[PDB]
Subunit: 317 residues, 4 copies
């Protein structure tokens, strides 16, 4: 997965991410409403959501989310972090306990901002527990965004939960966040204009083209840094998709250790100010959209907005 | 520009191309009908079209085409070829004379197949003449496709018009076609599966990521060669777009000598068997489609199918 | 600079390094004898050497060493580490205080092995103090070796002296050691034999060619990992030079921010077991050698072995 | 193999080359005297040498040369050119016939300059014939130099002997010469000084590091283009070795299809004006020299100057 934030000329923010995976997740955009009672798989204890939100989710016992945007402008995305993610084995105490795949639900339901996350996260404990559908502990890390325009990355390490100001506003997968930010120093020579002619693009030589996390990180940062400013929310959504097109894996390009096809299943963009969640997916290019605020946020139960599944083609004749 | 052919499991062919440029071309899909009389800018002599077709075009005196698919399955795309394209200065005789920006119109209107092109092209002469809108001679070369599944590339050189079997079924810009095909030998090590773990993609290391023509050529060939087979026309169109997403230039990424923004304005896919022309453009992700055969091909004049210009967003609520 | 250890088949060990700089250092190989009194620029306090050693140095008040090999088989090399080196600003107490440029003298004069290093270093303080010649505090980090065949890299950080087991037996410059070892994971696909014909070397595609520190680190690990075993000392010394030839900077190839030419001035190889110091420099390819043990190690004063400066040419006729 | 010419400030010229192979060639520097009779493996016909020369060769019936420098300042080197070399299968007439491995002997024995080459070659036929030792027809191409400072590369193709002015003064192996010169256009952004801090060398990012022929060609052009001027012959010879250090293959780094180790066996530098042949080999770094003119150039038979085989170490104590 590749994620990035962008800021438009009229001052909105979006958080955008591709979801690259071999197993089919079958996520759909879902409203998780306010005052919704759920029980953690860490210890069975009950929680009650405070803020409503929408994001890509799947009912697996509770409804687990890969990302989402809440009613107060906080947005979050969970991306794979294999080999680096390390959780608590032993249940602490005087802490809330959740499992890794609950963090999105937690943070979006209980926090209203980045300041808020930085504070509540001090009494949280994420513990090592499998996701049955996969029979494995999800190795994850998270990128978050709110209406101040700041960005965080949060990474569950052996040393505990680490929080970073994410200045580039980009994040992919392993290794750890400082590693990637340091790696950017190798790439400050790539630039849009040639120095002083098969065609255009020569300044761009050295941009990594492969699908490894470090290269996708560098290629996102390059394209974000030289993006012509986008005027408004819609133009921002387009740009985030244009950039993420460059990190879209066609089926067949990448094969896992198990002979599975690792490809981009969906790409989404979430707008912090407007509560809009846009997306397309491998099989349908047309942007789809859910507006959080058209819904009854005191709804009694989750609401699913199911997607158009095939290529939506506009016939001119 | 990046172009490529693909073949689906049910045996259709598509020819796909991005159109990367700094100046706004304002092309629209247009039907050029059968028996349509036009006069060449080479010498003023009259021609009469034999085959109807559709492609991206612009009225500039006559309607000039950047690509197109005709009523008998021949498809063609003109891509920039700067510094390498060389035309006839002196008007020969016993030949048809056209200017570079007429080749698409010519070949699509007068030829019914690749065999046919290879034969008619022997009595053709392309002469050096400007395109007024640009006050410059277009340096171009062409990729063509028909229902046999073969592909050609044709390149106007100092030595005359050169014709190549295009075995990879890919073409970008300069330098010449054999140069790129030879350059592919450097890249046969890139592969979808790692040898024997920040994540996926490690076999893919070395894939060029920059926007130069040679790198776009290599990156297209890689993605075409490892594309999981596409089952039918629609799935083929999706795949061609998924591959070309990887060669889509966001505004700002690439700047010309003149400080202009060189970006991908539109991407199209043309199906040889069905006469369908699909496309999207920088500002609207949704595929748009014109079916050649729904039209009256004996129409008296060109017909324009003008495109939806803004982002067509499907609202789920 | 690039440094690396090697093991020969007869189980000797060598530590090797190029010295890349813009300022002409003018090091010569010097013997520092045992029981030699000196005083630290840190605080003026007395030191008495315990172990004799040889290495490239220069008299600049006391005699400053870039590297060396001692009588009991410990070797060390100091390499530039700009932006990351961080020393103690304030004098602690109950500790031995030295300045950065005295580390090599200290460690080699006082320690008899890597174990001995890991223990004495626990009560060392390195303090921020300028080298006068250059009017700057040297940013440095160190690689060390002994007769056990283990290796260490020691890096002065904000948080204190960090000590790492150096498994690859390679170090260049910035960034920090764990950064580099982590970065090697992107390069595990590079390999001597092609997969399945311009010539040889296609498996090697991807090896970094530039002179930046991360690139030279990866290229040294590749070459060392795949070196055929060297039978003995001489062969070990040859091999080390053959590898480091690949990270040798000719004059003009790299230019600093101040417009100075930054180039490889000398290359040395030290054998741990035999106290042999071999080198060559930019202007004389022939290997030159100093045998620590041929000298009186109790000598009252340091002894300089000045290099043949010109290309030493063997004339066959 | 990698080869390159250099010009010194005092206007001497050198032609330099590494010899990379898997089979041990066992060349020694040999003087081929003037007025020496030999017969071609092509047809048994008589030849009488006109100009004495020295170069690395081996007695294999006649004495076969990989390179050399003649008495009137012409230099040549033969380098592998697999897949692209194409000789004459049938014996022509009114032409001098030779086999591939006799080119160096022929050109150097009979031609006094590059002009003289371009003229005599008009009536040369190179015929397909095996070298027995290897049971294969050598695929070869050649770079040449004289006292004018011009350079040529000559490549045996399907279509005849092609002769090119070699502006860069560099040649490696396959593919063809114009291929490489064209490929240099992708690399014009590489440069000694950074744009606007792990260390030095950031402008150099992008220089190819692998051992394939196109990569070594680009790396040699970069280094030669940016070499500081060498004051005189000796300095020229040093510089040539410093450059070619960067294309020096240690044992194990590259492995052939047959599982043989392909490594740099020797490196030579020939000065055109002075008939000086310098070299070193894998096992002995010290430069060794043969002075063509110290010999009797009318000598009745060839004379071998056998190399110091072991590392020649200069002992300072």
């Amino acid at each position: 997965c590749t994620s990035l934030t962008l800021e438009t000329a009229d001052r909105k923010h979006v958080l955008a991410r591709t979801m690259d995976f071999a197993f089919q997740l079958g996520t759909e955009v879902i409203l998780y409403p306010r005052r919704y009672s759920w029980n953690s798989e860490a210890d069975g204890r009950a929680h009650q959501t405070q803020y409503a939100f929408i994001g890509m989710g799947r009912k697996l016992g509770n409804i687990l989310f890969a990302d989402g945007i809440n009613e107060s402008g906080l947005s979050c995305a969970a991306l794979y972090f294999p080999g680096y993610a390390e959780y608590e084995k032993t249940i602490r105490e005087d802490t809330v306990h959740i499992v890794p795949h609950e963090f999105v639900t937690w943070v979006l339901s209980v926090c209203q901002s980045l300041e808020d996350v930085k504070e509540k996260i001090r009494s949280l404990t994420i513990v090592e527990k499998k996701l049955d559908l996969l029979d494995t502990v999800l190795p994850l890390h998270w990128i978050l965004s709110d209406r101040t325009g700041r960005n965080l990355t949060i990474e569950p390490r052996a040393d505990g939960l680490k929080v970073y100001d994410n200045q580039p506003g980009v994040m992919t997968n392993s290794p750890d966040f400082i590693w990637h930010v340091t790696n950017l120093q190798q790439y400050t020579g790539i630039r849009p204009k040639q120095l002083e002619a098969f065609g255009q693009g020569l300044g761009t030589v050295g941009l990594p083209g492969d699908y490894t996390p470090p290269s996708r990180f560098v290629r996102a940062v390059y394209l974000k840094e030289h993006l012509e400013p986008a005027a408004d929310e819609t133009k921002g959504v387009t740009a985030a998709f244009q950039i993420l097109a460059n990190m879209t894996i066609p089926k067949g390009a990448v094969i896992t250790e198990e002979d599975e096809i690792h490809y981009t299943q969906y790409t989404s963009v979430m707008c912090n100010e407007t509560g809009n969640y846009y997306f397309h997916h491998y099989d349908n290019r047309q942007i789809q959209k859910v507006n959080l605020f058209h819904e009854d946020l005191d709804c009694l139960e989750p609401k699913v907005f199911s997607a158009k599944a095939e290529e939506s083609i506009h016939e001119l004749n």
